[PDB]
């Protein structure tokens, strides 16, 4: 269980790292207006969940 939980947290911290690049990869091309903060605020806690 321990060695599994450490992989789970490493997975989570790699996904949170990928998220910063994915935010400007796939959210700034979505609308004429800029509300980038809420996209990260939502899918960060999606990664947490």
Swiss-Prot record:
It comes from the Eukaryota. [Alpha(6)beta(6)] hexamers of two multifunctional subunits (alpha and beta). Belongs to the thiolase-like superfamily. Fungal fatty acid synthetase subunit alpha family. Fatty acid synthetase catalyzes the formation of long-chain fatty acids from acetyl-CoA, malonyl-CoA and NADPH. The alpha subunit contains domains for: acyl carrier protein, 3-oxoacyl-[acyl-carrier-protein] reductase, and 3-oxoacyl-[acyl-carrier-protein] synthase. This is Fatty acid synthase subunit alpha. It comes from Candida albicans. The gene is FAS2.
């Amino acid at each position: 269980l321990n060695k599994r939980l450490e992989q789970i947290k490493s997975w989570e911290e790699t996904e949170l790292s990928y998220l910063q690049e994915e935010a400007e990869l796939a959210k700034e091309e979505f609308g004429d207006e800029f509300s980038m903060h809420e996209f990260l605020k939502e899918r960060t806690e999606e990664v947490y969940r």
